[PDB]
Amino acid sequence: NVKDLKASQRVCLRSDSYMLHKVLENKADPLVSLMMVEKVPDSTYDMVGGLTKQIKEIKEVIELPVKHPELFESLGIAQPKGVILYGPPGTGKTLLARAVAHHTDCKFIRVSGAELVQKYIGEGSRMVRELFVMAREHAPSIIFMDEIDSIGSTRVEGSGGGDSEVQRTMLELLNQLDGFETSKNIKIIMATNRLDILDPALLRPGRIDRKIEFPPPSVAARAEILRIHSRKMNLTRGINLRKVAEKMNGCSGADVKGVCTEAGMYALRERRIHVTQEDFELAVGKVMNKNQET
Amino acid sequence: FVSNSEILKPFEKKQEEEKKQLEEIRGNPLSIGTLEEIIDDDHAIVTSPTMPDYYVSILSFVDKELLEPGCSVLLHHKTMSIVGVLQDDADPMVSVMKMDKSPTESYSDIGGLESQIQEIKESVELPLTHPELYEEMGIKPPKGVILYGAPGTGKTLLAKAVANQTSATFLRIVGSELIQKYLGDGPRLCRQIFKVAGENAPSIVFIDEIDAIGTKRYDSNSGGEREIQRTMLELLNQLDGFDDRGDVKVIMATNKIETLDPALIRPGRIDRKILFENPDLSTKKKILGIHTSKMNLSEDVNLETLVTTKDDLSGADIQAMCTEAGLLALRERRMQVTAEDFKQAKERVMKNKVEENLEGLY
Amino acid sequence: LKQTENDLKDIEARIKEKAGVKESDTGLAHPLQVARCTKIIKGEDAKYVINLKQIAKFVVGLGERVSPTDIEEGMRVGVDRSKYNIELPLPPRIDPSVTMMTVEEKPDVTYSDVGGCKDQIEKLREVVELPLLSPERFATLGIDPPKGILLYGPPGTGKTLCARAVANRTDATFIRVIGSELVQKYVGEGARMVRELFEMARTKKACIIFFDEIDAVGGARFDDGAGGDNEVQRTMLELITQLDGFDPRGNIKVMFATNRPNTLDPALLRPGRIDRKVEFSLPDLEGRANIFRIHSKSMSVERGIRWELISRLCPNSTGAELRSVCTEAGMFAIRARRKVATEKDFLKAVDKVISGYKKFSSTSRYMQYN
Amino acid sequence: FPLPSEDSRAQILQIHSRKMTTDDDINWQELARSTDEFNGAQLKAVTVEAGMIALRNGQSSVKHEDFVEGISEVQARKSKSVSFYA
Amino acid sequence: VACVPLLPPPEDVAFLKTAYSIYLSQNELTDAIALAVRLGEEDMIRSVFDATSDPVMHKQLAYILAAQKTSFEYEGVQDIIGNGKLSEHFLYLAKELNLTGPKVPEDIYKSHLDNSKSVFSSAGLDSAQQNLASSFVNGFLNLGYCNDKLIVDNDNWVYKTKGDGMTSAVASIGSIYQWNLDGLQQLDKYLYVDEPEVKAGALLGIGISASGVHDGEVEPALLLLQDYVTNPDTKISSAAILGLGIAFAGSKNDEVLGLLLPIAASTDLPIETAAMASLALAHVFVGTCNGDITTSIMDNFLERTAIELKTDWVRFLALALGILYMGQGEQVDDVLETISAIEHPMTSAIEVLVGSCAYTGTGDVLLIQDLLHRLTLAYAVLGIALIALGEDIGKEMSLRHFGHLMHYGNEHIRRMVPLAMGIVSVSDPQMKVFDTLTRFSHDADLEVSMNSIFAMGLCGAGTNNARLAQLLRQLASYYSREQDALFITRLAQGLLHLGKGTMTMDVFNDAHVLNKVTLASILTTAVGLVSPSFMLKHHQLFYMLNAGIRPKFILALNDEGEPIKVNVRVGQPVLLNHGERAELETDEYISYTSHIEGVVILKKNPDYREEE
């Protein structure tokens, strides 16, 4: 009958008459085209370090208006808005922002910035409300702006073209979830590297609360990934994470993963099952040679 | 029902028989095509991804008003002649358009600005629910309003409260995405917004922070970039070339519209000027005092202490000083905020967005 | 339940409508994109079968004789692709294909600025209305009415208001086509697709089309473009083609709109596609005294008011700028709650609107020649 | 296309004046001297707008003054103004 | 007061009997105006005003009272102020009588029209096709001011047209002198000379000014009716019956009934086309109790002789029985068993209209369900949908009963549909009414679509403009359909701009009672507005709408010569000043006994008193 027919269901149809015979299968498993939404990602507690001052700041950003928003109305204030996080190159900030959805009991939505810019008839104009429907379907989620973020050294994140239109889209989004919907369960976290093209219209007291700065690399910051990635990577007991880090330079979040990757390539020549401190010094200068270029 | 006996008797006899005549002209493919043009001889044009070729003639069940040039219709099973018509609803395939919702808004936080609040209400909210005074007087009311200054300080928040005071359909259209590197996308999507929405009288379209369009200088058409100047040329058709009965209303709130203004506004279609004003002692009390209606804090601290000596703190600046000081007190799980968080929240707001030109004396 | 019983006589008449279909029952079941039929079973050379599509492209050199006895099969035979004419058997040819056309009815606009338009509107009447009255004076004297005409000035101060007001008294077909959307992407979307409208103008008579937004079409070039504006410039040259070889000026009119006259291509502005130019500027004082009357015809005003002293406060202006004075004067009766329009409301409005409200943001030095 | 001279503009105006009915008071060398750097596109507008001046006067045919009034028609910005002349 | 016929069907009117009895303390005369009315017992009306100790309130007791119209203007109820104006027991003001009887108000309404000014009109011009239409709106635009001085300059007013269009003339320009006492001097100048057919329709413009002032006539109008009858061409006398018919609005008079009684007794239909006086008698007895008209109607049935073969005058008696008994309820019960006693081939198609007129404004389920089986019969229709004119709730349950007027295999049923929603909204516009207009005259039979453009002007009563601006200039291109169809278009523009556009018939009343005279003249025209419908009748059925036309009032007066600024929520102005028009909105400050819309006496604290 017509009461048992769900929307968007795979059924059977006759050849010439096209008559519906019976319901065969259900809605297809893959959704849309590219779905980067991930709940409880591979980063749970410790993946990218430096979370000492980061957890303290992000705790009052996401958790409070999402989990128990009634604490703000009881106090008399309103909900906060997206937060901007910036730091030094060679980090993995994009992977660091993916762990925000763990302790907050929500999901993580990633949106491509450069792919949002579209020529001809603008798709990104409709992709704003298309992702709004996806944001409406799942309330516990965090929408992220990618491809405008910083995975490393970054110069120009916006200009008179479509690059700066991604940040200008947030002007109508903050007005949609508040000046129109008057309900917002989703906080959109931004990212950047340096401060150049940000306009005073985008930075407002309560549109963007605080811009968090990440700590620069140091002796203790070079053992950041060394205390985590060493779990799944085979090493020996003569490996001192703090002492070997003293012989490195300019590698904290991103490049230490690359130095540990080059250490596996050196063990392939010896064809052994272990990697000692001798193979580390070969990857200290080789990785820095690529960073000193250009 | 009463008529199910007498009147229904010479009814259902021809009601079921015509349904069998429908099954003769319908079947169950019900192919959905597209009608390009109406012919007085009752003939149609088929459209489909399979590239159909048909001479099909327009059948009954449709009229001249229902048939539309380029909207989907139902087709016959074999001959593929037009039968029914598809009903449009939900979200059209055009650019981003809001449908409806009821916000909760009033005049509270922007209190003290009532000097310029009652001004915009005269040309917007009043000529809506009371369609009068234009028959006796005969002067056409203005269309939209134009606001230039710092948004979100209570000038744009004023427009957010007016949207609810209309008690009708409100529309919000994005004015950013038109600046795409593609040439010619600007004037297209803008025309289809006001043409399809012309059925519903209330619109009140709001746009925020357009810094691009409006390059003119000495001549009307220069040799500059075509991604900008031609996109504005569509707005001239809406506000001047083709004018409605007062349904569509365009509102643009940006930083400085000076150079932007006299390519669009025209003398008398839209008359409004609202600029950000430094609040006096009376306005600052109504802005900060009403924000604390639901807020709780130490009874030993006066809210007017920092009002006497302060530098340009609007409702937007107070929104953060309430949130920043609130998050510090909430860490200890207390609904009241101490006095130390009041001055601490004012410094970081004044030391960041608030900067003067260091122009003294004069 | 009107439609319920309307199909009772329509389904019975559907067979009568099918009686016309009974002529050709083959291939299952007048504007057309390209002429297409199924096999054309009906059809020197006798029968004529031609179709252009992805399958079985046909061509025939001869023609002009009766094979089909008027309509045949798919009913669509006639002008498409150009190059292709089936005339002799009652053609459905030269018909608008799939396209975007804006066609409205009765663009009613009243008089706006008569101050400097006294003899200026008469030049507009000599365009359209003149051949529709005494065409005999054209053949005897040897003169022809103006076709192309240019509108330059501030953006709709009573210039454009006069353009839409005169068109209402023409009592002909009105079609509005702009230049901003005209760009699009594909080559021919802004030229060949609009050429179909120009070709139909010679077919369907009593048509009037106002070309709008010529700044997005024409304009002068130095380095010959930065790219993407070539089709924008080719559309300018496509407009010349319709006026190049041949064209009647009786049923076809050309009118532009822009903010400055010479910003176009200096070769485009050359005469013969523009016979006369509309000079729109700030008229004199006493000429605009009728504007104050037009707005006060339907407006209640206190008897005894003196318009002589009111016009002295207002310097040289346009028709729309004078309505803004009465617009704010109408708002003086809203807040201050005036019964009628008084003299103090008008004397203050000039200093309130022009002096007080207007201030900056106006067109002054932006028109010289270029 | 070179700038037509006196005798060059005369032969061009003779083409568009074939269908024109005149009073035979026109001197071809007289009208060409008042014209400077006017191509055939601008010369054609003179003969067309000449009869339009006689339209309001009710004249049966154009005369030598009507061709001079064709210059008085507004094409090259020949119209009048204020100040130095009135 | 307004909730009486809400949950229960209106079986008893007893709720309207005792109301003011609560007000015996402070004497509230505002909502107590209409209580015992519509019954015909006026003894309880005079006892309501006998509690007044306030000499000042009598100024406020004029405008709110005399708005009662039908059940007020009866002899002695309208003069109740003039009865004690000499010897004053309650200190009834003598000027209040002139405020009740509309002798004075023509002066104060003319002075208030200078606030919004006006647009005058003249020059009926030419083109007899458009000339009858040119003078139709020409007379309605000038109401409130005398433009007729320019009309006298015209010599031959038409001279082109023949038939009844040449007959009725003064009626077009007679609306300028409506209610005007001093305008009767120039109005009587249209009697002598002119044209023989123009002189025939001279009385139809005279009776327009006598509506409602019938008790205050300075000259008797009974002799004016007989003067036009004694003229040659007795058909003129039948056309002069509706001349005084517009003036039938007023008290109950037996002098006009005694003269029209033998006219209907002549009974020659085919020769002079006369004896139609019984059709106009419907507006004579309204709101009172009398059975005299029914007696003369019964004796005209059984005849059906060769002279009575006319099929028109027989149908004129159907509408007269429903208007006389409308809203009464007392003598209606005796009529239900009266006419039904004698049976004729056509009987139940008439009398059933009287049974539906016992209660106006509220639908009766018993009467609607009983008439469904009987109709499945020309005048048996209107006694169904016209039962409730004030209730929109009954329309939602009757949506399938309105379908009984639309979709059938017979095309004659589609002819009567336009009057379903047109008679309800004729006083004030609504939302879903104007949406009914799509396609009418494009059908096969021309007689099916008539009231289409007619209902455009009827429902168009209201402010200066309406929602017809889309079809306003579109109807002007239909002149190629029918010759009379072009004048049909002007019928809509005339009612929109009637009385300078600000004067229309509406439902606004201080007693919350609909106008009986307004609904009487509208119901007087039921099947067809013109002659070519069915057989030949008359073209004179238009101007009868001028009987119940009176200008409304919204003004705050503490004294007749001392006005005060008002406040009304209407605007773009917002809280507009005195001397303008508004719609159903109250005021700000507090008056003494009322604080309602209309003329209300205010009061202020002598310590702090706001002065204009």
mmCIF file of C-alpha atoms in Angstrom, chain C residues 30 32 70-71 75-79 84-95:
data_model
loop_
_atom_site.group_PDB
_atom_site.id
_atom_site.type_symbol
_atom_site.label_atom_id
_atom_site.label_comp_id
_atom_site.label_asym_id
_atom_site.label_seq_id
_atom_site.Cartn_x
_atom_site.Cartn_y
_atom_site.Cartn_z
ATOM 1 C CA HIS C 30 4.324 26.518 -33.910
ATOM 2 C CA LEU C 32 10.208 24.441 -32.312
ATOM 3 C CA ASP C 70 0.140 20.640 -45.242
ATOM 4 C CA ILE C 71 1.078 19.174 -41.828
ATOM 5 C CA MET C 75 4.019 18.451 -37.262
ATOM 6 C CA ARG C 76 7.344 20.293 -36.882
ATOM 7 C CA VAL C 77 8.831 21.249 -40.252
ATOM 8 C CA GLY C 78 10.166 24.710 -40.949
ATOM 9 C CA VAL C 79 12.859 27.182 -40.061
ATOM 10 C CA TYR C 84 16.250 25.283 -44.088
ATOM 11 C CA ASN C 85 12.941 26.486 -45.520
ATOM 12 C CA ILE C 86 9.789 24.458 -45.982
ATOM 13 C CA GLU C 87 7.310 27.121 -47.101
ATOM 14 C CA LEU C 88 4.821 25.916 -49.728
ATOM 15 C CA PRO C 89 2.670 23.466 -47.330
ATOM 16 C CA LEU C 90 1.476 25.996 -44.703
ATOM 17 C CA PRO C 91 4.693 26.143 -42.669
ATOM 18 C CA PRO C 92 5.152 26.389 -38.937
ATOM 19 C CA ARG C 93 8.386 28.257 -39.615
ATOM 20 C CA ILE C 94 10.348 31.115 -38.046
ATOM 21 C CA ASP C 95 8.968 30.317 -34.595
#
